Amino acid sequence: HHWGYGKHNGPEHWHKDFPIAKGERQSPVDIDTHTAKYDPSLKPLSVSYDQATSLRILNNGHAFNVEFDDSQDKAVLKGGPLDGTYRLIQFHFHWGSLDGQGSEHTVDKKKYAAELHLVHWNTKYGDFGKAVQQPDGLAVLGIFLKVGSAKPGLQKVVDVLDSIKTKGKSADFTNFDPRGLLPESLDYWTYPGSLTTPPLLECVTWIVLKEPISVSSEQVLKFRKLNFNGEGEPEELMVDNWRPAQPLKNRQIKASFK
């Protein structure tokens, strides 16, 4: 009986095992575009994914991750509200059973069809496990997905989903270029937050791009064909694996644009 997104183990139950679920800087949050403060002291983001080395794709039971080689500064994220260099370690999505929901972050209470999170850890802390234990250990780049035209660069990821249908399964997934999942513009919002899955640690600096990317109904539809369960167990479709918005409390959302 461990956490999940079902009725009995959903987000509204998480606080019982992870008391921090009711913390002061939890995520996601609703982004109010009229209360967000334009900070002109922010530098533009610097995304260097040219030497990115993907390695494996995996169904962990919660979402499917695409892992990268982070033994060196191959794919890094700097600039923006960040100090120091952050290494890309993995990216994953959050989607709904319908196109009217799926994103964790909301814009003016608006829900997108899904949300992509590229997870990075501050290289100053040596490794991921030490990073998560720091207030500025992680920097996550969030990207909203709306159903429309197809995103070519996402097709490779979609094709292999059949090979990682259930929890535990993983498949070699080399030579994938994450730059094909980026929108045209890098304008964003930023605020201090946390992971959106247990342990729900509050070590993340969120960077949520203003511009969403388009994916076809067919692409998002294949995500929903995934299972929460493991092979040989009753089938539970992997849908609605997003956490609802949390209280903003003592926090302000800064934008890099106006």
Binding residues for Zn ion, rule CB under 5 A, total 1
Token pair listed for 123: 């290289």
Q: Which stretch binds Zn ion (CB under 5 A): 17-25, 114-122, 144-152, 153-161?
A: 114-122
Nearer residue to Zn ion within complex by CB, 157 or 231: 157
Please tell me whether residue 117 binds Zn ion under the rule CB under 5 A. yes
Of 117 and 120, which CB lies nearer to Zn ion in the complex structure?
Answer: 117
Identity of the residue, 25 or 117, whose beta carbon is nearer to Zn ion in the bound complex = 117
User: Which listed range, 29-37, 48-56, 109-117, 218-226, lies at the site for Zn ion (CB under 5 A)?
Assistant: 109-117
197 is in an annotated binding site: yes
* Separation of alpha carbons 245 and 191, rounded Å: 14
Phi, psi at residue 141, to the nearest 5°? Answer: -100, 110
CB closer to Zn ion out of 117 and 151: 117
Which of positions 29-88 make contact with Zn ion (CB under 5 A)?
Answer: none
Instruction: In angstroms, give the least distance from the CB of 23 to Zn ion.
Output: 17
Name the one range near Zn ion by CB under 5 A: 3-11, 110-118, 160-168, 232-240: 110-118
Positions annotated as catalytic residues are 62
15 annotated as ligand-binding: no
- Given a contact cutoff of 8 angstroms between Cβ atoms, the answer to whether 185 and 119 are in contact is no
Query: Using CA atoms in the order 148, 150, 151, 154, what is the torsion angle rounded to 10 degrees?
Result: 120
CB atoms within 10 A of CB 86: 29
Q: How far apart are CA 76 and CA 123, in angstroms?
A: 9
DSSP bridge pairs for 37: 254
Which residues are CB-neighbours of 40 under 8 A, at least 6 positions away? Answer: none
SS3 14: helix
Q: Residues within the annotated binding site for Zn(2+)?
A: 92, 94, 117
Interface contacts to Zn ion, rule CB under 5 A: 117
